Design a protein around this ligand. Structure first.
Ligand SMILES: Nc1nc(-c2ccc(Cc3ccccc3)cc2)cs1
Ligand SMILES: O=C(CCC(=O)N1CCC[C@H]1C(=O)O)[C@@H]1CCCN1
Ligand SMILES: [Yb+3]
Ligand SMILES: [Yb+3]
Ligand SMILES: [Zn+2]
Length: 608
């Protein structure tokens, strides 16, 4: 097993046990400056040097046992960054530990970070910083073994402008004035559970908090706090169900932080402090599956971890599985099946997009010379979910399968594993059903591109109305348009309306008169739910309605969640009437976008 995304010494050579980070956030220079003290344990006899990951870091010195030591930065290897070799002052025996203190400064163009000016924030008076380390961006903040095969604890002390607040993926451990500068404050943090370094996270801004359950505060700028608190009020209930399914929650606190609109993801499962998009703020709790997902990662991903990024489906497929069980416990089994079948839809769309032979449609991927950000998609989520949901049905149902899941989490808690570790444990647990397991086409499911070789069984109860209405619009001729009316939607939930649009978007384009009639009768232009609006606006642009152009450009640029921004820009580039405006809008906004999203939209548009 090789981590082909890391340049560092592997876990077979040495392992980081602990990080003590001391740093200062400088908004004038857009740099984090500090010292990273790594406690490293040798796994070999006679260890005399090691190699760390870095990306666009300035190294001031390396100190061991109170003296400076020699080190060298290797040449840059594109998105992997530059290997940093450190010469140890004394040779280590196996299991010996030493502390290496590295003084460093980040680049303003750090791939991990977005720096926001006051005008980019809600409140308009203070700047803002946030990090996004997954997959391999920790190395763009601090030198490390930037591989999920290594887990460490951490403590940190962060100096900020005293008007601001810092938070991390860790338990808050107090705040004091910075004794070396009275315009600044030092915020302290402790992470006592070992974690892969991708889970390190930092935010600095004008943040306020509100308590929403016994172990949860929501944090955001003042303007978003009230709405956040209502939107995520199911959090404690979801935590209780997740503890039922996965075992104890070991992390102490489960806080939420609602980021600025440019956050690239729906959520990031940073331990103690999940980060979420403000595009979840629909006003009705309807997008709370994203919370159920991130909660679930407190078991699958954060406790049991993929050993390399080629086995990312372990993290994500299992988390989707748990997510859908949480939402199933809250709203019913028929709803679990509705969401499962929607996810198969998403998988169809991914596979169609990539093409059925594309190597990024395999469940287990080979990321040798591939930037993980470029590979990222819903495939590991939904092909991974599909595998588990197939297996559930093959092995005697959800209760039985959930017994496996809990046992799996107990077995591999605090470790990092591969697909073969998972499959061996599946065969062991289900030793009395090996004959059923040997019916699975494991080679196709794990290692072949395209749609999986078997589709699970799905209850259709809540899906049927969606399909029916979609088919009415698809088969409608001009003389049928008058028959449609706002009453068509009266018995559809918001999740059903979203699925009606998803079904219809799969058949897009529709005739432009159909799309005009849909606005006339349903007033989808008025709906602010981000999922619904995204789909509706894709429908409109693919169906070549020029009126939708400014609406889609607005949604593409006023938020940055990659799931919405990337396909809106690609649709707008594909419509000749909006093509030049899409490229120009991207160019104008690029410097103020998140660095990952900017890179990806530029790739998508063939721009730069
Ligand atoms: N089609 C498939 N893709 C993957 C996969 C996709 C992306 C990654 C890397 C990654 C993981 C998480 C955030 C950004 C990048 C690793 C694996 C796994 S199965
Ligand atoms: O799984 C999650 C969150 C999932 C996420 O943000 N998704 C899923 C596909 C679309 C995107 C989104 O919801 O915007 C993170 C990504 C880094 C690792 N865990
Ligand atoms: Yb020795
Ligand atoms: Yb007709
Ligand atoms: Zn996830």
């Amino acid at each position: 097993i090789v981590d082909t995304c890391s340049l560092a010494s592997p876990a077979s050579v040495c392992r980081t046990k602990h990080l003590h980070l001391r740093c200062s956030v400088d908004f004038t220079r857009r740099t984090l400056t500090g010292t990273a003290a790594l406690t490293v344990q040798s796994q070999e006899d006679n260890l005399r040097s090691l190699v760390l990951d870095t990306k666009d870091l300035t190294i001031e010195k390396v100190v061991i046992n109170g003296q400076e030591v020699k080190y060298a930065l290797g040449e840059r290897q594109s998105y992997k960054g530059s290997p940093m070799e450190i010469s140890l002052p004394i040779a280590l025996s196996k299991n010996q530990e030493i502390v290496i203190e590295i003084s460093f400064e980040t680049s303003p163009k750090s791939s991990a970070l977005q720096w926001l000016t006051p005008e980019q924030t809600s409140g308009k008076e203070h700047p803002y910083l946030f990090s996004q380390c997954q997959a391999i961006h920790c190395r763009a903040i601090l030198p490390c073994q930037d591989t999920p095969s290594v887990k460490l604890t951490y403590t940190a002390e962060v100096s900020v402008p005293k008007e601001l607040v810092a938070l991390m993926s860790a338990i808050r451990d107090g705040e004091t004035p910075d004794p070396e500068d009275p315009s600044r404050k030092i915020y302290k943090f402790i992470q006592k559970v070992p974690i892969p370094c991708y889970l390190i996270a930092l935010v600095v801004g004008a943040l306020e908090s509100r308590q929403i359950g016994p172990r949860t505060l929501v944090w955001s700028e003042k303007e978003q706090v009230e709405k956040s608190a209502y939107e995520f009020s199911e959090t404690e209930s979801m935590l209780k169900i997740a503890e039922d399914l996965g075992g104890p929650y070991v992390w102490g606190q489960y806080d939420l932080l609602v980021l600025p609109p440019s956050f690239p993801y729906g959520g990031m499962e940073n331990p103690c402090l999940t980060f979420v998009t403000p595009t979840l703020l629909a006003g009705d709790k309807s997008l709370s599956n994203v919370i159920a997902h991130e909660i679930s990662h407190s078991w699958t991903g954060n406790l049991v971890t993929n050993k390399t990024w080629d086995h990312f489906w372990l993290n994500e497929g299992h988390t989707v599985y748990l997510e859908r069980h949480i939402c199933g416990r809250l709203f019913g089994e028929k709803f679990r099946h509705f969401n499962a079948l929607g996810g198969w839809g998403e998988l169809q769309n991914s596979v169609k997009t990539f093409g059925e032979t594309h190597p990024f449609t395999k469940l287990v991927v080979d990321l040798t010379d591939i930037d993980p950000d470029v590979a990222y998609s819903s495939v590991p989520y939904e092909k991974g979910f599909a595998l588990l949901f197939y297996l559930e049905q093959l092995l005697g149902g959800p209760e039985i399968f959930l017994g496996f899941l809990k046992a799996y989490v107990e077995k591999f808690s605090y470790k990092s594993i591969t697909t073969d570790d998972w499959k061996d444990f599946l065969y062991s647990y289900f030793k009395d059903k090996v004959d059923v397991l040997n019916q699975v086409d494991w080679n196709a499911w794990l290692y072949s591109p395209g749609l999986p070789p078997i589709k699970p069984n799905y209850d259709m109860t809540l899906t049927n109305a969606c399909i029916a209405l979609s088919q009415r619009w698809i088969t409608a001729k001009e003389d049928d348009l008058n028959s449609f009316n706002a009453t068509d939607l009266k018995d559809l939930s918001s999740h059903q309306l979203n699925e009606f649009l998803a079904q219809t978007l799969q058949r897009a384009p529709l005739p432009l008169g159909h799309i005009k009639r849909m606005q006339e009768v349903y007033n989808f232009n008025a709906i602010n739910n981000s999922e619904i609006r995204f789909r509706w606006l894709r429908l409109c642009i693919q169906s070549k309605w020029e009126d939708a152009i400014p609406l889609a450009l607005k949604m593409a640029t006023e938020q940055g969640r990659m799931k919405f921004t990337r396909p809106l820009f690609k649709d707008l580039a594909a419509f000749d009437k909006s093509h030049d405006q899409a490229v120009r809008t991207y160019q104008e906004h690029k410097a103020s976008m998140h660095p990952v999203t900017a890179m990806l939209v530029g790739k998508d548009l063939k721009v730069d």
